[PDB]
Design a protein around this ligand. Sequence first.
Ligand SMILES: Nc1nc2c(ncn2[C@@H]2O[C@H](COP(=O)(O)OP(=O)(O)OP(=O)(O)O)[C@@H](O)[C@H]2O)c(=O)[nH]1
Ligand SMILES: Nc1nc2c(ncn2[C@@H]2O[C@H](COP(=O)(O)OP(=O)(O)O)[C@@H](O)[C@H]2O)c(=O)[nH]1
Ligand SMILES: Nc1nc2c(ncn2[C@@H]2O[C@H](COP(=O)(O)OP(=O)(O)O)[C@@H](O)[C@H]2O)c(=O)[nH]1
Ligand SMILES: [Mg+2]
Lengths: 439, 430, 430, 103, 97
Amino acid sequence: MREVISIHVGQGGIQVGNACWELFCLEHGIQPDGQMPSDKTIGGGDDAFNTFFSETGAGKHVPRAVFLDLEPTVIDEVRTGTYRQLFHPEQLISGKEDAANNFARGHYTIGKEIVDLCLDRIRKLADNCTGLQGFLVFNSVGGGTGSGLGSLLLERLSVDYGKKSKLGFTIYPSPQVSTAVVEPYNSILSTHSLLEHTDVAVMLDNEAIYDICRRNLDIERPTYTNLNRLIAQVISSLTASLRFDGALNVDITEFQTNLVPYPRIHFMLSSYAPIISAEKAYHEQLSVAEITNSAFEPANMMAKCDPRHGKYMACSMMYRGDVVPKDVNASIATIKTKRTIQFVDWCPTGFKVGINYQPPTVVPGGDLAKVMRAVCMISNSTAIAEVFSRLDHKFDLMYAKRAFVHWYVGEGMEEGEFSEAREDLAALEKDYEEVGIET
Amino acid sequence: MREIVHIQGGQCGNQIGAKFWEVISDEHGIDPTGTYHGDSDLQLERINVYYNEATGGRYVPRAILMDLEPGTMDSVRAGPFGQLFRPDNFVFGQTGAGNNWAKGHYTEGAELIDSVLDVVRKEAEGCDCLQGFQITHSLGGGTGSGMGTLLISKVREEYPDRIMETFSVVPSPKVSDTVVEPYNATLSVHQLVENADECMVIDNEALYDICFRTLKLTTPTYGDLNHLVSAAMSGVTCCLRFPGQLNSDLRKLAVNLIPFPRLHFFMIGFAPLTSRGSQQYRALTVPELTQQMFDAKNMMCAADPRHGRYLTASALFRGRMSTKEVDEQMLNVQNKNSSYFVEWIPNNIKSSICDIPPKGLKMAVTFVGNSTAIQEMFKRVAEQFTAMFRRKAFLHWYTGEGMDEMEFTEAESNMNDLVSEYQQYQDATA
Amino acid sequence: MREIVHIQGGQCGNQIGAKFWEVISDEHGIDPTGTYHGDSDLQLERINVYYNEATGGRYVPRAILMDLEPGTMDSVRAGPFGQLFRPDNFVFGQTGAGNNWAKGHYTEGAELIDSVLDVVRKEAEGCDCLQGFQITHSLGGGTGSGMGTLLISKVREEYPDRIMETFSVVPSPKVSDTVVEPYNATLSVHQLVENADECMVIDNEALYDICFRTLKLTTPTYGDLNHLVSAAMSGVTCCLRFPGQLNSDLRKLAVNLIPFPRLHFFMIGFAPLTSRGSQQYRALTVPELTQQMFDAKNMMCAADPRHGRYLTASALFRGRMSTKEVDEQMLNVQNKNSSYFVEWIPNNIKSSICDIPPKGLKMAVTFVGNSTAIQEMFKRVAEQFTAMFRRKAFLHWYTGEGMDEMEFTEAESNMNDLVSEYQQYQDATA
Amino acid sequence: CDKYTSTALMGNWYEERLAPNQPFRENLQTKTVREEEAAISFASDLIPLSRVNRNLPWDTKGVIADDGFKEFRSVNRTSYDPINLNNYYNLGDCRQLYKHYTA
Amino acid sequence: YVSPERLNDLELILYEKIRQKTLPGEDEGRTVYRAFKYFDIAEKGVIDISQFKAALEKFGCVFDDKEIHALFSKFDVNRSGKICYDEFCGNFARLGS
Ligand SMILES: Nc1nc2c(ncn2[C@@H]2O[C@H](COP(=O)(O)OP(=O)(O)OP(=O)(O)O)[C@@H](O)[C@H]2O)c(=O)[nH]1
Ligand SMILES: Nc1nc2c(ncn2[C@@H]2O[C@H](COP(=O)(O)OP(=O)(O)O)[C@@H](O)[C@H]2O)c(=O)[nH]1
Ligand SMILES: Nc1nc2c(ncn2[C@@H]2O[C@H](COP(=O)(O)OP(=O)(O)O)[C@@H](O)[C@H]2O)c(=O)[nH]1
Ligand SMILES: [Mg+2]
């Protein structure tokens, strides 16, 4: 009766989901066929799959998912792939022509012919659901289709449903490594729409993920699927507290009312750990003390922005496993004293605690091993202004002489919208500077 | 879905197309008889891209074979895989070209173009949805440049929203092939810019240079030269026929490779290409393989790239490669050679991945680059035209079939404009 | 059950019927001796439409073959399928027509039309309920024009409640085969219009045009021309003989194709058609069938259907096909080309379906349409007729049988108005 | 093949000893390659295009020769490899307390 | 047990529908040949009776297990208990030309 609905748009979101939903299946024990393995279930989890699944009437199960992509290349592979029977056959909207990294293309001419189907599918999925708690949106902004569809879809969703909360796991361009050179334009355009419709967002830049992969798992040549696996783990840890018993539950509604000082500043950067393989762990640490220290380490952060360059506002840490309560207070007290990580003046108490019982679960044949507990942390610190500073510098240099402007201008997006986007982005950077001024 | 039509023109083109269909037939596994003998399941999911379907289970390339002399078309039919082409897809005249522009674009070509124009439209509407255009022709030749370009303008007229590409063997003065080459070349480049979106030149001079230096076969012949260029376009459309991590259609290159509406000249290259005697000795790693791609002599165009600075680059890695190696290698190449890339555009190396590599290799890279070094190519062609034009030589044929020097004057104007404008950015600073 | 008798006279008339019986027999699978060796039961259910019942289980086709010169009949029975026609039916004279209209309608025929009307009456009375008549004759031909035209005049006056068809071949301007064609041709239209409810012109040029262009036969003979028209006749009477989704008898086609009492001239076209060397390079799909249908060249009439606006159209598909496909395509073509369809009567094309395709193929289309473009055929024929008359050339032949100039002068007038009326209903809007 | 007939250590001799065959270069006279016939189609100008004697195709294999690598598998499929998952199913607890075969 | 002149009748209805699902410009062998390679995983050319139940279950035909065994066995000439897709699809193209 407390359920959620997932929104995935774009190839990046599709690939991340391909691992997120497989892990979701593995932890609750649901085969790809849609049939539960029995094995004397006798309702072992009983009322357990409501949070992410709904009854099919007799036997099988249908995940609450919606898939969107204008390019059928990945949609077909998912359809005929390892989970052929899982998703609703008609719930996978299939595109006809690729967006080809054109934000204007993805927002004003081709996008208008699929948002109707997206709204219809979302309406059908939600209405049957009883207690829709919010939205979970995965999208990519380093290209056309991702933003061009996601921003407009969220815009329509807000006017369709209103005050209902929403969370978004976007993927901004990395400081050094990226694919396209038109990525800055798409990021600048997408931030304009996303800064006033989404409440809680998380940056998951690829560069930090690669760094973390090199250091811990000792896999020098990581892959895209391996990168997606960690994001899937982060999502699972974030949403675990909503569907399992615990000593203190933190519902999805208790993030914005806990981790956003003002309506405008609503971007957070998070991390996950520990990250230890099945080879070099069992002879190791992971007493509860060291996990908390590893959480605040700068190099381990999931975004290429040093938290050491700014203060802190509020971070919510959710433990999963068998962590005894008092260990949490001990870890918090130890972390507070150290001078390396300091807080802003205006928030004396800025830690949220949540304890759940289910240990994190692992997928077969992965790089992750099984340990007895782990901690996932979400952080919003003034350092995050650096990433928006860097994305700022790139745009100005190549807009000085309207580089690649025509592909956007001739597609319908008025030339004046770039002015608005730049003005608003400049406004945002000013915003973060003042909050840190000491009292 | 998103199938692409293929257009052929001129003798130079006719040799490209026939061999081009050589490589695709095997990979899809369609034999000389048109029957299927594939091995992998993933080989049919997108067979419709280049091949239609017909009764009896046989497949035919959706091609257009077109030239003004019967002898040229005779060879393709009688040669290998000459049985894959529908007879209705052939159009030919009876008079020949004789290396005269006017005979190709105003008088002789016009009377027969209507027949050629009608054919394309019927095939174009048959497919579910057009995705683009590819034209195989030549500029230094007789029939192609004149009668081929006209079909470029005509096709672009009715279909303003479809993007297109072009393959052309621009001539090199060293290995001369015709005295009248400067005319039919500069005259051709004039009209190509205004309508042709994507054009990637291929220089025959590099073919010998690439063949003897790296291939180093005893006596390379026209069979092999056309073959290496064949793979170039085989992998250009890689994302469309196979799944992959980051699919990239033709237009993605268009958005990411043409900073301005007119500056649409690309130089391509292929790798790896190793001799018959060094086949088994080189390691197969992104590091070693990527070194060849940006090498000065691996480029497929006579223009030396190190003489100028690049603007944008996109290379489509084919086969199972660890992306991180692709990403990391990109950073290193962009840092140790900063002086050869324009500063004002940051993060100017594109990347792409695919699942299925060409048969017989686990790595394969098709490098498409937009470098300022192409100006010397036009400069070399342009300078000869001004010298020889002043004397009015070879001018009585052209003026006698509907060509007026008042037109020729404009042509040189356009060539210089591109030559002058192109080099503004090379010295431009932020 | 609505059995239809077939009547054809004239030397040219005999040849077409000589084959039209050839193919139709094959469809029902009756052997030259006439004994049944068919395959399925559907081929025998409605056999009463053409063949009657006689001794031995064989059938005698209901054909009344007529001519004025013995040359035709001695060869009609000399070829394959020369044993089906009954000995008594044939009626022929020992004089000859000599390509003169007069001797074929007033002097000789007057003493020989009694016998022909005798047999024609006997056959009709035999039918349970006569559904109509079908007539094939050549207007430019001598005996056919006179003896054939008179038969329609008399037959109408006895059985006004039955529908009449007319397959006519009117000589064209380009392919000339008779010097006295204008005179006898003109008298044909005048006498033909006032009696024949329906007519389908078939110009010889198209038959030659179809063969030299589409089928690509090096040296077509008159045999080929007969088959193409013969097959078309098979299409019109299609549903009346086999089950189907939507029945369509002869009257229904008239109801949907004769907007007014006078405009009763049609133009037919047959598809598909591809060369033996192109049969295996094509796809048999409903979309492909429809395209060739409305293309100008496919039709067997000299008039260009792109110079006017259609008033009504009809479609008769063959074989098993999806109903929705028939509807969707039919709506599409009429929409994309509004300029070529008049604006005062929507839903301007009729459709039908049958479940027995012709032998040798899987899908085919038969078209029977009425277009204002037909005005070209009479305008060109009339233009030449006026030239001859003003010089009173070759007139002495016609005056030798009692005919005066009054019938000639009127003929021009009525042929004038029929030219006018097509003009009026074409260039008029709401 | 430097102004010689191979088999002699002339300049650049290591390669030419490994040529596949190139049947065209050693049989210039047999010609043949007459398989077009008077098809009467492709095409009619009605006269079919004159058919000319075409010579040998000249071999090929310019692209790197097959390295015994068929490949032809999709990246995604092996990523999840549903074979991996089931092994974490209906199996395990295997230490061979006694002897027993199995699939 | 039942195998009267009713099993072949299903073949027509089974065939009649096949052309219904067939994409334009395709042969029933093409549509079916894909089906037997979609559900299956062995790839040696065989599946169980249930898998063949899944294959025809997609087509929409509603039959009992008794009739299902009829066609498989009728399509299982050797009695080996397995079905080969090559012969199955090719034979259908024969009837539906
Ligand atoms: N780590 C990771 N990054 C991805 C993945 N897919 C896409 N990306 C990121 O996305 C950027 C390019 O945009 P894409 O996400 O591929 O696609 P898009 O922005 O939605 O636009 P399209 O190309 O039309 O799909 C790349 O630079 C990647 O950083 C993925 O599966 N894993
Ligand atoms: N590299 C290369 N160049 C070719 C080939 N075939 C033709 N060419 C070039 O094409 C030019 C001749 O063009 P041509 O066919 O006569 O033009 P056309 O008369 O309009 O058909 C020559 O200068 C050649 O350099 C080939 O197979 N390889
Ligand atoms: N298309 C076609 N036309 C024919 C054939 N045989 C005769 N004709 C035409 O018939 C005309 C001669 O007509 P004619 O014999 O005088 O007609 P008749 O007086 O009724 O016997 C010629 O001009 C031909 O055009 C044939 O086999 N095919
Ligand atoms: Mg994409």
